[PDB]
């Protein structure tokens, strides 16, 4: 609960000229870690460590940038992941585990749930030791499964998920209130309710328009 | 030698000044009240703000570009030329959106952008077009920024259009008048690659001198060309960023291009995947539920053998620009197709055209005034 002790303090931080400072760095590194570690977020800390790496190149550490990227990759569709890119140099991509951080980064971006998992490499006990961000990227494809499926097969939605059990299948099945239909998909949504058509309907401005052509 | 007698001369009389606008902004009334009296014109004491936002902007790109070790401009500045000015209370006139506006301004430049909630929630000051069509400016480029491309494109539309009813007159957009026309057409024309089988907008936004060249231009970017990603990219980069000044252009220094690889690869990583996106949405949802004989069709369309059809024809669905279904037993592809709005021009004209008619009877009743 370090993350709670922190929010206070780094929040006066980085509204001030301390963001800009690159003495703050310990301090603000400890709380990057503070983020992965006890699954929390806060993209300000990020980005301003982000943005005192992009100053001084020499101060950029591998694993504290690690620990902002794959928590940037959690927290998908959105852009926190883009500003990552943007203040990483072109020395810096090309680090450990940088590079591979980042091509798993790409996957998930174009939405290739398949390959992410196949993608991934075991051995680097880094990524086991981020707290969630195993479930986190399962809660992302699922999130983004709601959003454009109207069904999903049984064995589909599985091999999405990194190639699931019938009974670890049961968790995500369970999760969106998701279930089971004749022979033999998995219902996500209905048809109607996935569409969402704003379209032709306008010509409905009668009431402004009379109120200024009034006089 | 007089590149640099000109540069230092800019920011020590900035720097002298930036102590005068603490001191007088904040306790000194006396000295504000002597200061409404005595001219004719207010506008000398304002427009020396927002003067110096692009030109200090200016002499420090150009100290940024030229030291890029041993880091003395970007910290400085941060620190207490940003700050200093701007955190503080404001000055009473729109002074206090200028020196934000200023703020807005060298906080764009870098990449650091996140605190745009609540410059907005300190614009308390009513939205003059003077300081709305600035914030717009940059308000529609963090849109941009945030892949909303269906939100900042309306937005480009209104600062383009030339009837947000600006007269100007006395210099507040001066030297930069075609930056405002050029940039403005030039982020509008990355975000209609993005999503457009929409807008039905693009009508009011650009004239058709320029939609007709840009018009091509996505086609030929999407469908058959790689050409376009280059020539897009060169004009999108000074106008993405802004960087005021590029320095002097020689061998024999360094020191400038260096500042210029990550600035430009920053916005090769925007553009890479989100024109990719493109030319799957290119390519006319012909029948908006697909039987076996479309679905083919689409897929003999995508990829060819064998290997992997399927697989990426699901990926891509994923990303914002398809809401479909898959069926087991029927195995069928349903989708959906939605289109815009036809006019949404004529409304909006109507104020515009009468403004038209305003002017028009207000202007030779100006002449009407000094001829009589």
């Known amino acids: 609960a370090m993350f709670e002790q922190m929010r206070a303090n780094v929040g006066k931080l980085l509204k001030g000229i301390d963001r800009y400072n690159p003495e703050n760095l310990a301090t603000l590194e400890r709380y990057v870690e503070t983020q992965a570690k006890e699954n929390a977020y806060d993209l300000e800390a990020n980005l301003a460590v982000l943005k005192l790496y992009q100053f001084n190149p020499a101060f950029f550490q591998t694993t504290v940038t690690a620990q902002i990227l794959l928590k940037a990759l959690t927290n998908l569709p959105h852009t926190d992941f883009t500003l990552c890119k943007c203040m990483i140099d072109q020395a810096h991509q090309e680090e450990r585990p940088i590079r591979q951080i980042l091509y798993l980064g790409d996957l998930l971006e174009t939405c290739h749930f398949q390959a992410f998992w196949q993608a991934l490499d075991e051995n680097m006990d880094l990524l086991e030791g981020i707290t969630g961000f195993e479930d986190s990227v399962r809660k992302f494809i699922c999130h983004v499964v709601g959003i454009t499926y109207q069904h999903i097969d049984r064995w589909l939605l599985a091999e999405m998920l990194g190639d699931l059990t019938d009974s670890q299948l049961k968790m995500w099945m369970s999760k969106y209130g998701w279930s089971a239909d004749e022979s033999g998909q998995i219902f996500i949504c209905s048809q109607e309710e996935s569409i969402k058509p704003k379209n032709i309907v306008e010509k409905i401005d009668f009431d402004s328009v009379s109120s200024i052509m009034a006089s | ?372």
Not at chain 2, 270 to 296: C, D, G, H, N, W
Not at chain 2, 320 to 341: P, R
């Open chain 2, 1 to 372: 030698q007089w590149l640099w007698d000109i540069i230092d001369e800019f920011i020590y009389q900035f720097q002298s000044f930036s102590q005068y606008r603490c001191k007088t902004a904040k306790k000194s009334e006396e000295e504000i009240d002597f200061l409404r009296s005595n001219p004719k014109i207010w506008n000398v004491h304002s427009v020396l703000n927002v003067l110096h936002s692009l030109v200090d902007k200016s002499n420090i790109n150009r100290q940024l570009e030229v030291y890029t070790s041993g880091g003395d401009p970007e910290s400085v500045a941060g620190e207490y030329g940003r700050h200093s000015l701007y955190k503080m209370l404001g000055y009473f006139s729109l002074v206090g959106l200028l020196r934000l506006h200023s703020l807005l301004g060298d906080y764009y430049q870098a990449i650091k952008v996140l605190e745009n909630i609540e410059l907005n929630k300190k614009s308390m000051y009513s939205r003059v077009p003077e300081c709305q069509v600035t914030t717009y400016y940059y308000v529609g480029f963090a849109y941009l920024m945030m892949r909303r491309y269906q939100d900042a494109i309306r937005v480009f539309a209104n600062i383009l259009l030339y009837i947000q009813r600006t007269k100007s007159m006395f210099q507040r957009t001066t030297y930069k008048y075609e930056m405002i026309n050029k940039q403005n057409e030039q982020m509008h024309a990355l975000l209609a690659i993005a999503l457009t089988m929409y807008p039905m907008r693009i009508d009011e936004s650009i004239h058709l001198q320029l939609r007709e060249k840009y018009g091509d231009k996505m086609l030929r970017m999407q469908k058959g060309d790689p050409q376009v990603y280059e020539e897009l990219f060169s004009y999108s980069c000074p106008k993405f960023l802004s960087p005021v000044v590029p320095n002097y252009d020689s061998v024999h220094p360094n020191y400038h291009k260096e500042p210029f690889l990550q600035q430009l690869k920053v916005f090769s990583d925007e553009v890479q995947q989100q024109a990719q996106l493109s030319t799957i949405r290119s390519f006319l949802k012909l029948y908006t539920t697909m039987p076996v004989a479309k679905l083919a069709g689409f897929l003999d369309l995508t990829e060819q053998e064998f290997r992997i059809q399927l697989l990426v024809f699901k990926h891509k669905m994923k990303n914002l620009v398809w809401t479909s279904g898959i069926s087991a037993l029927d195995g069928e592809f349903q989708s959906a197709s939605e289109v815009d709005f036809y006019i949404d021009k004529d409304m909006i004209h109507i104020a515009d055209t009468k403004v038209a008619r305003r002017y028009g009877d207000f202007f030779i009743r100006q002449i009407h005034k000094f001829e009589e």
